[PDB]
Amino acid sequence: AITKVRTPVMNSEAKVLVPGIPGHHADLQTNSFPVLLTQGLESNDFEMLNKVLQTRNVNLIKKTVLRMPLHTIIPLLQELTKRLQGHPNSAVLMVQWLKCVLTVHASYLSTLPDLVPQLGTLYQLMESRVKTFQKLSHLHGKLILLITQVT
């Protein structure tokens, strides 16, 4: 059959750039658990880090990051970045942990290492994630009206 149409090859080896990925832009107490977290970071173990991280008490996180060794906070930042994308149930606790980290422990300290590219990726990720706020608000309004109709 005669057709004067030429089709370029589109395969699965092509690089895809979405806004969320880096290339698109640019005294004996149980008050803390530092010694479990440090060797959970030295050896990447899912269960040990899940025991340490999955908490809710704020001052526990405060004292844990205070007593933590100062050359291993960056692995903690990687694990927070990895665990932030997920269902909100696990994500809210991780946001609380991150807020506890940057708010008090390293508000002055993190200015020193000059390692901003490591933090930049998390900035881009949470910049990308919040793009659907107003659509979610519209959906929430309609759902509230529908629920009003339910009762």
């Binding site: 059959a1 005669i2 057709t3 004067k4 149409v5 030429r6 089709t7 370029p8 090859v9 589109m10 395969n11 080896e13 092509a14 690089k15 895809v16 750039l17 979405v18 806004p19 290339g23 698109h24 832009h25 640019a26």
Partner: protein
């Protein structure tokens, strides 16, 4: 009921978003063809070479449906790199915008997708250009958008342990005072970038990316922006919406002259100093040939077309012509083409088998 032959010349489409381009490899006119396709058309003989499919998706002619449009395209270092921009605007609030880079495979003799970028900008892309200098070590692409940012993309090594590959990554992001970016251009050398932010023009150094200079005469927003070539390369020409054509001298950082000429098409000759401007008068389109050094036009022709001229192009003729007079000398280097509103292309002219014997048809 199957197709045996096709008789077609230049494809008629409702709107030609891209300009008239010339593919360096085939010396053929490239523009919008079928919806989602770029037509490659031979200028010498009124025959269509082919259609190249950029978006490979089903098309339905049902009325009142928003369709994806291929808006911008450009050719990079010779014909090696092709950049395509597509968008869909179902509503004003949300836009789908996508950019694709195609590299030419010499062995395959076809294009293959290299890098696909989803949402490169947050608003419509207005300009697209490449660095055709060959003195620059790295190929460079610039995308400007109405969101107020222009982005500089560079080709970087993407090799890893598993496989060896190359890809495009973002290099620089620029803005000025939250103003929309309308036009962008490179100098002949690739050393300077001229980008128009609404009324004003800003000049950046491409090597280190700092804002070197700024020109703002309070006349109007810049419609067309171009650099001079060859012996007038020190000059920069700017046309405004309020019918003003002004020439800037980069060395003096001041404007040499300006005129009231409302131009819709301004194309710089690649192989000559001449600038040809198509001005939309009430009676019809008019043409002016001039050189940026001198504020007087060399040749003036009126009534070239009763209809509006929306695009034009200069094509380097392979064998140069000879015209001694300065009025006709602009015809020597290259041929000029222009496309009217009714999609008519106009230009300027001075003038046996062995089986016959095997099967015994010869008896």
């Amino acid at each position: 009921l199957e197709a045996s032959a096709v008789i077609q010349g230049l494809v008629k489409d409702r709107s030609i978003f891209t300009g008239l381009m010339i593919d360096p490899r085939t010396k053929a006119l490239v523009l919008n063809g079928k919806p989602g396709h770029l037509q490659f058309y031979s200028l010498q003989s009124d025959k269509q070479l082919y259609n190249l499919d950029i978006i490979q998706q089903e098309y339905i002619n049902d009325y009142g449906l928003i369709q994806i449009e291929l808006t911008k395209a450009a050719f990079g270092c010779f014909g090696n790199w092709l950049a395509t921009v597509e968008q869909r605007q179902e509503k004003e609030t949300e836009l789908e915008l996508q950019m694709k880079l195609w590299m030419y495979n010499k062995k395959t003799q076809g294009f293959i997708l290299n890098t696909k970028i989803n949402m490169p900008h947050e608003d419509c892309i207005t300009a697209l250009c490449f660095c055709n200098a060959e003195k620059s070590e790295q190929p460079t692409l610039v995308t400007a958008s109405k969101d107020g940012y222009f982005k500089v993309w560079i080709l970087t090594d993407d090799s890893d342990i598993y496989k060896k590959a190359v890809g495009w990554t973002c290099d620089f992001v620029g803005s000025y005072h939250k103003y929309q970016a309308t036009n962008c251009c490179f100098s002949e050398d690739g050393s300077l970038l001229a980008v128009s932010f609404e009324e004003i023009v800003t000049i950046w150094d491409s090597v280190t990316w700092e804002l070197k200079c700024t020109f703002c005469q309070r006349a109007g927003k810049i419609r067309h922006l171009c650099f001079g070539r060859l012996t007038c390369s020190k000059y920069l020409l700017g046309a405004t919406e309020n019918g003003i054509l002004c020439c800037w001298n980069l060395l003096s950082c001041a404007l040499e002259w300006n005129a009231k000429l409302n131009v819709r098409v301004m194309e710089p000759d690649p192989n000559s100093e001449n600038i040809a401007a198509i001005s939309q008068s009430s009676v019809g389109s008019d043409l002016f040939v001039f050189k940026p050094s001198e504020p007087r036009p060399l040749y003036i022709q009126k009534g070239i077309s009763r209809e509006k001229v929306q695009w034009g192009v200069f094509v380097p003729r392979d064998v140069p012509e000879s015209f001694t007079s300065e009025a006709y000398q602009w015809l020597n280097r290259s041929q000029f083409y222009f496309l009217t509103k009714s999609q008519s292309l106009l230009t300027f002219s001075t003038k046996t088998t062995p089986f016959y014997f095997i099967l015994g048809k010869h008896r």
